[PDB]
């Protein structure tokens, strides 16, 4: 009953760097095939890379797409493994899972953490964007927030509209 | 569906299991080993040794095998005071079963001091009175001659002599009681010497009195003459508690009350009567009753792994072997043979081997039981406020042992469960092997555990196979003839 | 309910060779059987279970055999201590009925005019096994006469 | 080495009731096939009935003669089993044994207690018996006791007469 | 795959059950004793020291036994596997005698 | 010869490993306690006895 915790992700500018980490609770007979995997919000789950234990060298096996971009290694002294984000792109936006096969051999990636989302949204160029002073930025803030709410209450009320089935079937047995 | 835990798996289903942890207790404080307890009730040990007004049913208590006591004995030590070395006295009582409250120094001795003891806080329905065993020396004739009491041990056993001194609250009150100041109380025996000096000072109003009683207790071992000497403030004992016998008693801090039973053990929650070797009821047992372990259940898988089979029957009149799993239809014993002869199919156990296995299990658990023989009278000692370290030590020590034994119990059955389960499996293999090695080349090893013969075998030859006397050369020629073609 | 009897009913014979006590059966009790020795004045012991297996205390002088609806026990070397009631009991049919039982003694050879050449161990064997059932008969007469007294009490306190 | 104790029997009027009990000492791996059996002083030992443990219901299997007369059940809380005598008859007079097979399976009724005798003697009718006053009862008491003794000393001296074999063979080696 | 997963589950459950059974005093801080309480101090030390020794035993020997408990267990599995295959191929195989 | 020597080595190493694992208090001398320290004495006894 080992709980894999993880942290590090959030909002990052493209081309930045980030310190992802997943750490392990509970008594693991082995933490050999430590693995980092990711799932974009598009639900195309893709495997990233390895890291192993003392016994056979702290070797790694990265995906071809991420051969040199991300770097996986562990600082074994506190039973945590780090993944470095470098040279970030828009595609990197995904919820990242720490994963691990229980046996000494790979049979099932069968311990998954809650996942940490990482979000690299485009349109952050400053070709024309830094020209505006405090006032223009504040005015677009005060024009974008209200529509933010009314849109999300609209989505929540239509979710309620598709959810009354439960509200009716409870009294309908 | 009795499930047991073993070293390898968890919640394994077994055919039979014998829980060896007595989780249950009747819950009533009952007489132990024929000898009734000492039903104190609301009076503390000090209250009984002094004989408060609140409990005069104790003036001659028949022999007790254990003592109870409420957690906060509101009706003990009526006069606001202390009791020097209370806990040593309680621990001594833990190893004493019967007192006899012999006279040592009756009120007749003190003809020069008024023996009238008075106390507002310890009143008897509004009247001033005092502990029965203590006499409250005061001045006589506006004078306090030097009290000089003595005693020579005669009864042939250690006598508990309990006395005290008075710390008055006022100089005026000191003098109006004893007519002199600079008072001392000397008590000397052949080994004890103690010269207490009462001091009068302002003390917080407790039960209306500022002054206190210091109480001391001692043992007159063997013809040890005791000498009380005082120029006042002494609270003499008129009652020396000779101890009738040694023994093994205890103090149970329980609020219950005595009922009628007969149990060789007794615990603060309730009595324990069982043949099991462990119990998670309460550590502070008394007498002949089993070890305590912090566990919740100890199930010994005496049975064998209860694997059902798929039950595809009625087609060919014969059954599948032990490879696919056990037979629901076998009731005669753990291990056996199903013989599908031409005179009629039928199960039949192997009585000898299953009896051997049951003897092995029983001897295993019994040997474990015999090896466990530890401290019997694990009663709970008491410690004063300034002995906290010691108390902690005690606790830790005691607690450590419980933990160790819990381990030594839990893991044991854990290992033993595995020790048993595969053992059963082993037996079956042996049985199969034995039969396979007694039927060298006359059987098609049907591969599910069976043996489908080459020669027409009546019930007699198969009965011979069962009891290990099968005659191979008798059927060798016919079996070879059938096998060749 | 099945029929189970000791064909060689209660007998008397000397010591030192085989005695065979046989047990019948109406239907197929496979081999589950029990052979009990009962010394008069003591609780029954156990000799053979499953019709051939010896008890915990193996006398090395008893043996069993049989199958189906036909079983037997043989004492290959009878001795003085082996005197008592012998029972066969089946455990197959739901009524665990018992056998008729067989008594074993000597043809009046217990007096010294017959066992002059026998050993001296049987002397203390008989000293050990003599008293208890003598008391048992004494208190048997005592209890029958107490029950004969009981009506007198009943009528005394009746009125 | 479990000692089966038992108690309850004695002198009972016909048609009465009695609380037989047998209890168990020592550590029994199972007390499953608890069994009550009886032996009349006529040495025709007869099996009475069962009682089992938790695992398979506290079921019973009584003899046909005693289907409804005696009732076997256990109060497991103190590891004892009771047998109730109801509707007693003269035939019920027997020494009752508690018995028990050691294994989980019935192979031998191989634990027997000392037995408790129960005695239902006839002739206790009061068709004509209660008429007598204290004096007649006392006189038949004082006429039946003396013959009681002289008869039992007669039987004891003839037992001695048949027992001198030992008294002679001790000095005869 | 199936049998090796079963074996790994057995090992993991074994060590985990050992772990759960070990639950002892938590706050084992060190008490202090004055110069005239030397006896008491020694007692404490001895008591504490004894427990350490016991647990050392109860640990060391455990893994010792458990190591044997495991090793032959593995060997046992292989035999079973072989036996199973040998018992599923009754008379269609030349038992090549090296395990094949 | 080979197999019996292996078995004897196994037995000897077994008992020897048990022996090495047992290393406890050396100077288990008996302390003394005064009459008013009875509790402490009992504690000691119990501890040691345990
Ligand atoms: C009073 O206290 C004394 C403490 O010394 C108790 O000890 C007894 O003292 C007397 C002398 O006072 C001694 O008795 C002697 O006994 C021997 C025995 O042969 C005899 O030869 C002497 O002539 C003398 O009588 C002895 O030390 C001791 N008596 C014993 C131990 O029996 C004394 O017992 C106390 N008085 C009582 C209890 O009445
Ligand atoms: C193992 O079981 C076998 C078979 O049950 C027994 O060995 C011998 O079996 C024959 C059966 O043909 C017995 O011969 C006769 O049997 C008939 C009917 O069963 C019976 O009516 C005859 O009186 C005669 O016994 C033969 O006696 C029997 N041998 C012995 C020594 O009993 C035997 O039960 C077992 N053999 C062992 C344990 O060595
Ligand atoms: C107990 O056994 C049941 C049987 O199916 C199982 O479902 C359950 O998970 C077990 N409990 C454990 C392993 O803690
Ligand atoms: C207590 O248990 C014993 C068996 O250990 C039994 O003999 C005795 O009768 C029991 N006492 C009771 C239930 O009062």
UniProtKB/TrEMBL annotation, chain F:
Coiled-coil ranges (or none): none
Post-translational modification: Palmitoylated. In natural infection, inactive HA is matured into HA1 and HA2 outside the cell by one or more trypsin-like, arginine-specific endoprotease secreted by the bronchial epithelial cells. One identified protease that may be involved in this process is secreted in lungs by club cells.
Location of the protein in the cell: Host apical cell membrane; Virion membrane
Record note on quaternary structure: Homotrimer of disulfide-linked HA1-HA2.
Role, per record: Binds to sialic acid-containing receptors on the cell surface, bringing about the attachment of the virus particle to the cell. This attachment induces virion internalization either through clathrin-dependent endocytosis or through clathrin- and caveolin-independent pathway. Plays a major role in the determination of host range restriction and virulence. Class I viral fusion protein. Responsible for penetration of the virus into the cell cytoplasm by mediating the fusion of the membrane of the endocytosed virus particle with the endosomal membrane. Binds to sialic acid-containing receptors on the cell surface, bringing about the attachment of the virus particle to the cell. This attachment induces virion internalization of about two third of the virus particles through clathrin-dependent endocytosis and about one third through a clathrin- and caveolin-independent pathway. Plays a major role in the determination of host range restriction and virulence. Class I viral fusion protein.
Family: Belongs to the influenza viruses hemagglutinin family.
Name of protein: Hemagglutinin
